[model samples]
Target: MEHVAFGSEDIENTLAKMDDGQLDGLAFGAIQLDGDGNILQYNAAEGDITGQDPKQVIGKNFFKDVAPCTDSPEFYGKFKEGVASGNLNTMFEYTFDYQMTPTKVKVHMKKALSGDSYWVFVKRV
Candidate 1:
């Protein structure tokens, strides 16, 4: 079974089974956020990919403090909509314009099958 692979189909279930530390080895970015969008666990790949410090982002809101661009309807709104529905399994293509190069990423969101945290898995496009 795959453990937090970006393309894993049952990503939510795997994330729920593993602790946040195990997510550090991911090739792509794996950010664990609370229902309110706060950063619960920021992985090494996420920091390396975005050129930010993972430790510094702990407890801060990912959609607001970290990436305010996602605070909009399509991004953060989707999270809210998913939370309301109790199933946040959505993926989309989005651009990260706040930082250098305007990197575009494959954004995947999933609410843990039995946990309180939501995950944002990113792949460079």
Candidate 2:
């Protein structure tokens, strides 16, 4: 499901918890990707999901090393349409590997530091 009520602080708090949980060995990936598909912020959850460390992913290209599925024109094109359509609340579940098991996720987008960019928060469903 889509959630648009979370503020910036809310996101920060959630990210902080991910670190503490990391010590306990729970795997999760929390990322904030910009509209241009750039990695703005990444957390331990993201590292776990992609098998990379946060330090390695923070400044790297997500479309290249993290989620190559998003690099597809069809997927990104649909994302642009959804955001442009003013559908502030949008969500869906999809399978990346055609293994009959899909990853459950929630993505909330908000305006970022620039007019051409946005902040996207990702979480497991």
Candidate 3:
């Protein structure tokens, strides 16, 4: 796979065009966190999707913003378990309230390097 610098201008430029209505609508921010849960680089797509810039989220806990539903110990533990095992990929479909409308979301996560994170693909119900 191409080693994308995840937060470089090249990626931003690429995503800028790709981030149209077809790739837009109810997107989200995702960041790779450290063992102590400090944010690393935040991607342009993630920022555009979440309505927040990278500066707003980098160096902070990702779960606090990107995925509060996984705030519990059990949830986080399982997430880490998938990371440690190093052969796990998970896909889950969900919905959330949107101006009193239910919106559909699909989260797909994979093991990268030694840790794990997610790529959240979203759309309307």
Candidate 4:
């Protein structure tokens, strides 16, 4: 059996209630980014999934510098739209292929109601 803690429907509320340690203990990758996609938080699982060190990714724009593949309309576009609209909870399947090998992942984006901050949850697909 797997540890099923977070759910897509309740992701935003759950994350809001969790602390940093709780976020880090998750089985899947969890990345918290600012409105501009700057990496505010990157967990150990995310490093393992992407094979990129957190030290290298932190403070960098996820869509621009870290993962250019997601910078396109499908991913980043939704992020911008969500932030501007104040309702940015959505999930979809996407393939990431930049310098590393092509990998498919389930991407979840959750935004705050009043800020330009968001959280991204990823699981292998």
**Which candidate has the top score in TM-score?**
1
lDDT of 3 by residue, 80-113 (tens): 6666675435556655432224445554444434
> lDDT for every model?
0.83, 0.50, 0.47, 0.81
Residue runs of model 3 more than 4 Å from their true location after superposition: 1-30, 35-37, 72-77, 95-103, 114-125
After superposition, the stretches of candidate 4 with alpha carbons farther than 4 Å from their true spots are 1-6
Model 2, 39-80: lDDT tens digits are: 766666545544557777665666666566666644565556
State in Å the error of residue 101, model 3. Answer: 8.9
For model 1, the stretches where C-alpha displacement exceeds 4 angstroms are: 1-4
Number of the top-ranking candidate, with lDDT as the measure: 1
Which 10-residue window of candidate 1 scores lowest in summed lDDT? 1-10
Comparing 3 and 4 on lDDT, the stronger one: 4
Per-residue CA lDDT of model 4 for 46-81, tens digit only, reads: 888888777788999899888899987889999999
Query: Candidate 2: which stretches are off by over 4 Å?
Result: 1-28, 82-89, 96-117
TM-score list, all predictions: 0.90, 0.52, 0.52, 0.87
Model 2 lDDT at residue 120: 49
